[PDB]
């Protein structure tokens, strides 16, 4: 997948820099409460670590997610 990278942290950096609040997220991975196909938005992060404040809008649950696992469907606007 896209966190091809050798830790995959790079593709959590590349992702953070264009996910600013407003940019529409998918849940590509199942992971917890959340499950795969998901659709949400980018409402905040933790800008150096893994933590990731989504608003999931099929559950209606804002949660913390995982950069690698986070599909972009931003530019909504």
């Known amino acids: 997948m896209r ?3 050798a ?11 264009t996910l600013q ?6 849940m590509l991975d199942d992971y917890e ?3 795969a196909g998901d659709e949400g938005e980018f409402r905040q992060s933790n800008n150096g670590v893994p933590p990731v404040q ?3 809008e099929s559950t209606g649950r804002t949660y913390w997610v995982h ?5 972009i469907l931003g530019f909504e606007e």
Not at 21 to 26: C, T
Not at 67 to 71: A, G, K, N, P, T
């Open 67 to 71: 950069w690698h696992m986070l599909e």
């Open 54 to 56: 989504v608003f999931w």
């Open 33 to 35: 409460e959340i499950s």
């Open 7 to 17: 830790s995959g942290n790079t593709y959590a950096l590349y992702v953070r820099d």
């Open 3 to 5: 966190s091809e990278f």
């Open 21 to 26: 609040p407003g940019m529409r997220v998918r």
